[PDB]
Amino acid sequence: MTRFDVLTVGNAIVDIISRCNDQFLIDNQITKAAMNLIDAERAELLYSRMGPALEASGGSAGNTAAGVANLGGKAAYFGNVAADQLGDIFTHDIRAQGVHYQTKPKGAFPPTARSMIFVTEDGERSMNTYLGACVELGPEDVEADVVADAKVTYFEGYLWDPPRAKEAILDCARIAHQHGREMSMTLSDSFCVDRYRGEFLDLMRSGKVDIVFANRQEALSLYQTDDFEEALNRIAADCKIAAVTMSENGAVILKGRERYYVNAIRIREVVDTTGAGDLFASGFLYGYTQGRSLEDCGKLGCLAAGIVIQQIGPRPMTSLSEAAKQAGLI
């Protein structure tokens, strides 16, 4: 028996969410459906143009941890906030979900990361992220005991943007594999992949990463192809297990030559896609650390993703464990 099922590591972010029309994205040169990194000046400018908003704790890996805890798994999180009101909100929300979170802030400045997320009528989300205190995450924030005691350590591709987070991840990989644990990553975003293609391929091919999460766009970006079948063949060769999501078209889990297709749950209406991939990783990794079949890990993933897209905000406000029980995934 181990202390944690899943440790996640990522950029600690509070989301600022508003709806906009499609013209708003064009006028503000915001790349639709993408993570757009912005500086402090652009953050102020975009906020000045944004409509009334709501705030919720975010961060891709933060969301994933919360989702694991929600399903009933034991989760931990590494990520760096500031000693400010946004940081206090982030700390409260993740701990309140029952996730182990002990990363200390290093001061009030830079302030806690925030992402302005614009949700269009089609439910798509376009994020505009000021990293703030995330730039300070480094090897000093690795709780070695936690990595040692976690069945899976999962991290964001997004961590390659701040300067020193990658060093922390390399320490995690070493500790995890020394203790017979597994390392997992999400490719995060297709432009993220564009930025760090060589590095991400290295992580997988050298076996520092065991389990890779991607959506169709990220997988195409990774191999700079328009051929999805090529991309699936290549990703399966480059990592031990790949879980590749295809929105409404479901998911496919790959292992060597094995392929496991999973249906997406049928939706009433796509409210806000924010958090879909994160909560897919929640369900998959909850399943995985419970010893479930890869198909069942896929099903748990699709269940969690389907639920999170029917609400505003990235972390489900309802019981995932109860939804899983009702679904006979249990």
Ligand X SMILES: Nc1ncnc2c1ncn2[C@@H]1O[C@H](CO)[C@@H](O)[C@H]1O
Residues that bind a second copy (CB under 8 A): 19, 47, 50-57, 66, 84-86, 89, 92-94, 96-97, 111, 312-313, 315, 317
Footprint of K ion on residues 58-117 (CB under 5 A)? none
Do the Cβ atoms of 155 and 10 come closer than 8 Å?
A: yes
- The two most distant CA atoms of the chain are separated, in Å, by 54
Q: Which member of 112, 274, 282, 289 binds K ion (CB under 5 A)?
A: 274
31 is an annotated ligand-binding site residue: no
How far, in Å, are 21, 100, 180, 315 from residue 36 at the CA level? 18, 29, 36, 21
- Give whichever of 108 and 317 is closer to ligand BZE, judged by the CB atom: 317
The answer to whether the annotation marks 91 as part of a ligand binding site is no
- Min dist. Cβ of residue 313 to ligand BZE (A): 7
Task: Return the residue matching tokens 């376009």.
Answer: 126
Nearer to ligand X, 15 or 136 (CB): 15
Is residue 76 helix, strand or coil?
Answer: strand
Q: Give exposure, 228-256, as e/b (b: 16+ Cβ within 10 Å).
A: eeebbebbbebbebbbbbbbeebbbbbee
Helix (H) or strand (E) run with residue 288 in it: helix 276-289
301 in a labelled binding site: no
Q: Is 278 annotated as a binding residue?
A: yes
23 near ligand BZE (CB under 6 A): no
> Choosing among K ion, ligand BZE, ligand X, none, which partner's interface includes residue 17 (Cβ < 5 to 8 Å by kind)?
ligand BZE
For residue 57, give every residue at least 6 positions away whose Cβ sits within 8 Å of its Cβ, in sequence order, or none: 13, 14, 15, 66, 89, 90, 93, 94, 314, 315
Q: Per the annotation, where are the binding residues for ADP? A: 215, 245, 247, 250, 277, 302
**Footprint of K ion (CB under 5 A):** 272, 274-275, 308
**Footprint of ligand BZE (CB under 6 A):** 17-19, 51-54, 312, 317
